[PDB]
Design a binder for this molecule. Structure first.
Ligand SMILES: COc1ccc(Oc2ccc(-c3nc4ccc(C(=N)N)cc4[nH]3)cc2)cc1OC
Ligand SMILES: COc1ccc(Oc2ccc(-c3nc4ccc(C(=N)N)cc4[nH]3)cc2)cc1OC
Ligand SMILES: COc1ccc(Oc2ccc(-c3nc4ccc(C(=N)N)cc4[nH]3)cc2)cc1OC
Ligand SMILES: *[C@@H]1O[C@H](CO)[C@@H](O)[C@H](O)[C@H]1NC(C)=O
Ligand SMILES: *[C@@H]1O[C@H](CO)[C@@H](O)[C@H](O)[C@H]1NC(C)=O
Ligand SMILES: *[C@@H]1O[C@H](CO)[C@@H](O)[C@H](O)[C@H]1NC(C)=O
Ligand code: NA
Lengths: 410, 409, 403
């Protein structure tokens, strides 16, 4: 019969086709696809971020005591392993006099010694580095900086959000309307450079990280530099990422050892911290917990090889609520010739000092808005069924109530 | 056994109600997603470039009459009308002032801050040591004056009065705009004490913006320092965002013909200041009278310092739907080289010390000949709604829209 | 059944919308970032802004190229302008005396190589992930700035280097001496003459040549410059959805090819930075033919040679930061260490520090917005909604359209 052939001829193609296309939409769904929704929304306020900054130098040269030098000199490249000064013809005369004086161990009774105490006491004091401080055109004081220990030593966090302190906000973008600090980096307190190590800088300045209050600073890896002699502008953009969990993504939605709120920085410090305690029964200045802080012998012999080997293991995925701060750096010179003499008079320093040691850091929001980056689900379940039902109710006539009629037969 | 059957219709009917209502809610969220694209081009329209010298008024162009009317405002006179004892700056300046600042037998003359701003301001004619666009030279006539919160400022390629807008045909260092600026530090007003308005900075402020929007360079600027050639690698972005209900965008288009966040902020900030003090600042549009130095101290500084905190929503300025943004990557090298310092001093009758204190080279260009497009697309249209519910009907039931119409009888 | 005519019209309406939408070939974008344990480090190409060393310029160099280089006026003599330091003006006034001189052959590629800055003397210090490296890790490549060097070229069978940690130390950390004293003196102005001093750096995939005259950034002396990178994997869509195109293709290699086919066709000449086997331009040929020939291409024949984007692309985003060099504590030491003045150090030394912010890579991918499977579901659902229709019912109406 020609018709009931041409009929079932092209109907069998149509059932193979529905079988084909319906398999495509079930395979796609099981890839669990997502797409991205970029949006920007206007705002009237914006919570100002946390700002963590460090002097590139860890210990003030003048704050080193005789006791400090006995224990830490070989650690700091100020004594060779026989405990005396190299007398290298590279030196400041006055500093090498100060050192050999403090480094003469005749009839010396070693005293107790601790690395947090050294870091805390020898570290640069915000009270003397913070020549000037203004937030939204109102004044601020070293009280507004919370101390934090990083691999760069005693560092400070503005608007840290801790100890019941509210988070600062801003109501206008641009230079005057955020944080504007004038720092004095104190170059002549830098520990001298007579030979080289992994831990030696020719660098001079500060290191800065702008980060949310829910995450600690990781300023040795996430920092940026600000150099002396310039007022450096930091124009920021608030980005609110909302990312998708598994199966759609690799997000971490949950709660999270030594911290309470999960964040990639907080996670990487745990892997670093437990590894060092497990392999050396020891922690470093930047690590949380209760372990004893490392001794100079323990660092030379144990912790440095333990970290050196650790890199050559621990994966830390992104959280689902993440607020990031994008920034555009720009800079102009300080001081102007007109203000150079005044700044020296104002702070009892020479004009040469001001241009070698003064930086102004100026952090603000470009404008009152925040960008939103959200992974959205591409193929929900409701949309699959509409797609199959439409494909069924097209290639054939079936409903799901029909396919159940085929069981009422058998 | 047909109670298993009408149980199995009542269930499958409930499932259609649930899944179909989900797509009705989703549709009512008015969802959108984003389409990133990059498209090649053979030419590319060059932006406007607005720049300001960080100093507002040239020290040498300040007259006796200026000092009488604006001297206390500018931290050049204490409220007794004299140099403030401290006098912490070099004699030749302070000598220049002690003569200009002697009001014995002085007859005050009229004064206007815009006239002062225009007249004392840095002149593009002395600032612009050199200028090249697409390797061809340019002159101060290609820069148009605009008054900003920084004063008398200059915009390259302003696009106004029927002048064609420049284009570019190649990316990289030379193939856009390269200026050598003299910021003229020896003209900066002295600093003897501090004010809200006093800076230790020296250099220029630059904003790269489309010609459809005015410069708001005291917020949207960036700094360029003297002593460097500063490279500005730009990427053109044409973002097209969606109106309500999908977004919060503005397609509608007072003080300006074309909507822009900047035009809205300057407009709102202007209406506020005129309402509360009958007074506008130099950077503001319109026809209101310009603030006098007394009106600033007595009215506008407090009026603005109060709008900084207790206000905000007098204007939320929403984004327009068709927006061109310029991304910029800043880089720099030192100018001048040891070989070219001596040549540069000779060229401009200036000291070698001066050049390293006052010369900057600004280099604005496109990374490459293309533009990115960031585009909001609707995720769930009405046509796709019907396809989704119709299929669920034609799946859980055999139902059509006509079938549900028979059930009303 | 009266208003059936309406519901059929609505099916025509909605079905035309989703059928036209399909043919726009819509795509939307999928942003994701995925964590990694290792990460392949890029190539880094850098140039001294200065092309030829003053000390390596010979009398023969000066005869053929002195006018090309604004070192001689078109009478072949020194401008004798005292606008440069005496020792160098004496060095050149000497080299420029053409009494009894037999000119010898000369080609521009040799000059670029020999007078160009030598990688062995610029590279004061080199560390990759804290381990030492040597000028042997730098492959020479010729760009418009002359003899330039590419670290981790990935060429000559060397495996591609990786890094396992982010931050300051764990990338490439070179300390350069830009050698301000070998910069050619500047006596007058040219298209090709600079007041600048420092280097130009480009971070690129090993699969593409550097286009450092267009895509570089500047590094200045007197600073350690921090370069924080983020690896981006772009996967973009071919036609009809997009305009991407699927030794190795790259946008850079496409432009350098258009630039070379054009210059050889019109001047039978190639420039130092160009690939192939054509002869290199003589100073007169550049003067007489190529300089106007390239000038013309930018204005009229960019439009004829169009270069589309590739479909698998790895980009490197960079954030520049800097701190001062050298510190007062280390200023005296670096002078002693390299037998140079403290003022020389602050005028000639930069430390370039390239690294990844952290161990992850972003992926920006164009995805198809409306495929064919999803079209049918939408129209099929619309058919089974406004009417009862399947495709079979439409075949009954063509059966019945056999009466
Ligand atoms: C308990 O916590 C810790 C204990 C020991 C640690 O090990 C070291 C810390 C610092 C240095 C070091 N800092 C220098 C600065 C300048 C110079 C210079 N001469 N320019 C030389 C320096 N050496 C060396 C080893 C680390 C810890 O926390 C990370
Ligand atoms: C009609 O429009 C306006 C009227 C008044 C305005 O008020 C002021 C404008 C400028 C200053 C100011 N700029 C200084 C720079 C350097 C120094 C220094 N001593 N170095 C001191 C300065 N004082 C102060 C007040 C503003 C207006 O429009 C914005
Ligand atoms: C076959 O390959 C080529 C041949 C010729 C080319 O043309 C020129 C190459 C270099 C210069 C040039 N470099 C200078 C550096 C310093 C100074 C200074 N006075 N300080 C002046 C300089 N002039 C000019 C023209 C280009 C080629 O390939 C790109
Ligand atoms: C966190 O995630 C929740 C999930 O619903 C979301 O509503 C909220 O906006 C996110 N942000 C904060 C700061 O809680
Ligand atoms: C965007 O702007 C251009 C010119 O301003 C105009 O031609 C175009 O129609 C506008 N709309 C879109 C969606 O591009
Ligand atoms: C390139 O695209 C292909 C898709 O066919 C993919 O398999 C591959 O991982 C991509 N990346 C590279 C580096 O080739
Ligand atoms: Na659908």
């Amino acid at each position: 019969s020609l018709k009931r052939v041409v009929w079932a001829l092209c109907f069998m193609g149509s059932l193979a086709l529905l079988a084909l296309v319906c398999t495509n939409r079930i395979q796609y769904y099981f890839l669990y696809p997502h797409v991205t929704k970029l949006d920007e929304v206007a705002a009237t306020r914006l919570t100002f971020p946390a700002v963590t900054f460090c002097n590139l130098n860890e210990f003030r040269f003048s704050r080193v005591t005789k006791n400090d030098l006995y224990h830490a000199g070989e650690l700091l490249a100020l004594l060779n392993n026989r405990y005396e000064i190299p007398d290298t013809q590279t030196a400041d005369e006055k500093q090498l006099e100060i050192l050999q004086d403090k480094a003469n161990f005749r009839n010396f009774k070693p005293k107790p010694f601790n690395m947090l105490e050294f870091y805390d006491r020898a570290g640069h004091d915000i009270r003397e580095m913070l020549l000037s401080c203004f937030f939204r055109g109102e004044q601020c004081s070293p009280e507004d900086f919370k101390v934090v220990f990083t691999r760069y030593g005693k560092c400070y966090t503005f608007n840290a959000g801790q100890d019941g302190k509210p988070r600062l906000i801003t109501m206008k973008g641009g230079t005057g309307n955020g944080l504007e600090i004038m720092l004095d980096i104190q170059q002549d307190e830098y520990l001298p450079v007579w030979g080289e190590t992994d831990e030696t800088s020719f660098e001079a300045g500060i290191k800065v990280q702008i980060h949310s209050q829910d995450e600690p600073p990781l300023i040795d890896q996430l920092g940026f530099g600000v150099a002396p002699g310039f007022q450096t502008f930091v124009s920021c953009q608030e980005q609110r990422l909302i990312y998708l969990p598994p199966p759609w993504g690799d997000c971490k939605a949950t709660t999270g050892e030594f911290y309470d709120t999960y964040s990639i920085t907080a996670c990487r410090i745990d892997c670093e911290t437990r590894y060092l305690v497990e392999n050396c029964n020891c922690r470093m200045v930047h690590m949380p917990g209760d372990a004893p802080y490392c001794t100079p012998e323990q660092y030379k012999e144990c912790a440095d090889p333990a970290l050196d080997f650790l890199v050559e293991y621990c994966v830390c995925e992104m959280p689902c609520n993440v607020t990031r701060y994008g920034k555009e750096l720009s800079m102009v010179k300080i001081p102007s010739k007109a203000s150079a003499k005044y700044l020296a008079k104002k702070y009892n320093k020479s004009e040469q000092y001001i241009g070698e040691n003064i930086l102004v850091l100026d952090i603000f929001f470009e404008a009152l808005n925040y960008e939103t980056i959200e992974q959205k689900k591409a193929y929900e379940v409701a949309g699959l069924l509409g797609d199959i039902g439409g494909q069924m109710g097209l290639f054939i006539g079936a409903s799901i109530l029909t396919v159940l009629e085929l069981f009422d037969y058998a």
